[PDB]
Ligand binder design. Structure first.
Ligand code: HEM
Ligand code: HEM
Ligand SMILES: COc1ccc(Br)cc1O
Lengths: 137, 137
């Protein structure tokens, strides 16, 4: 289930994080509007760019914590508020997170592994709802 | 407290893992007996090797899983058994773990961040006791 998937991802978190975020950027190339420095770079070039490696690592370290603190894939409202109030996220909207989780679910379904993709689909929808309630446009 | 410290560490897991492991290796030079491939390299030379960060991150992920599953800083006997039975740990005794947590507590106390160093010292002691109970010499 969802809780075991958190353990699976955490057990190889750097590789999963970079692969899922790359899947996001390659499924939705226009999302580089928020990452101008990512333009004109292959996956392997991005993986050697410090700001990509560091942001991606932060994304998934904190996402696994938010998932871990969730009940039945519903995040804490306080976790959603913290995400909304992050300064570097000022230009984001719920659509950015929606797309991230569509790519993550697609990645899990395509993997060879026993991920509970339905739970991650719910988690992403419930996070988006919570971000909206917390003030994200 | 302890639970928040797990969240702090997980929030920047690779960085904290490398810095705490380096603190251990430098406090106890003989402990590189179990790390032949790290001999003859400075802290920054080690951090530059992707395998060092990869290994340290995976170690500390399991450490955080054991810490999060603990009750009042007492680890589960089943988690201690896992650590005893790991093939990678066949050469080890509890003193190896005692020294790791002495260095970890020293790192936390010098950090100037608000770690609950007392709880981590207790956790390390209770982990050592639990490793002994699970069959480590
Ligand atoms: C759970 C999801 C996310 C977490 C935990 C997270 C976390 C962080 C953190 C800690 C920083 C600093 C940061 C910066 C940033 N984030 Fe996120 N983020 C997330 C999702 C996103 C998404 C979906 C986007 C865009 C599609 C994004 C764009 C950015 C940008 C542009 C910065 C500034 C980075 C820079 O200028 O170097 N983040 N994020
Ligand atoms: C609670 C404490 C510890 C945890 C959670 C832990 C966990 C782990 C994990 C997950 C690995 C596999 C690493 C990987 O896949 O890259 C590993 C390997 C290893 N650990 Fe531990 N460990 C702990 C303490 C120690 C201590 C104190 C020592 C020695 C002083 C030690 C020595 C080793 C060695 C020699 C390996 C083999 C290195 C390799 O993977 O090639 N561990 N440990
Ligand atoms: C002493 O063994 C270890 C302790 C902490 C990390 Br991080 C990695 C290790 O290999």
């Amino acid at each position: 289930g969802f809780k075991q998937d958190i353990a699976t991802l955490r057990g190889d978190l750097r590789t999963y994080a970079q692969d899922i975020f790359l899947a996001f950027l390659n499924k939705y190339p226009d999302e580089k509007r928020n990452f101008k420095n990512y333009v004109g770079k292959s996956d392997q070039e991005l993986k050697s760019m410090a700001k990509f490696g560091d942001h991606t690592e932060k994304v998934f370290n904190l996402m696994m914590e938010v998932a871990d603190r969730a009940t039945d894939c519903v995040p804490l409202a306080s976790d959603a508020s913290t995400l909304v109030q992050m300064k570097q996220h000022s230009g984001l909207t719920t659509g950015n997170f929606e797309k991230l989780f569509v790519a993550l679910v697609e990645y899990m379904r395509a993997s060879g592994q026993s991920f509970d993709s339905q739970s991650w689909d719910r988690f992403g929808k419930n996070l988006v709802s919570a971000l909206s309630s917390a003030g994200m446009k």
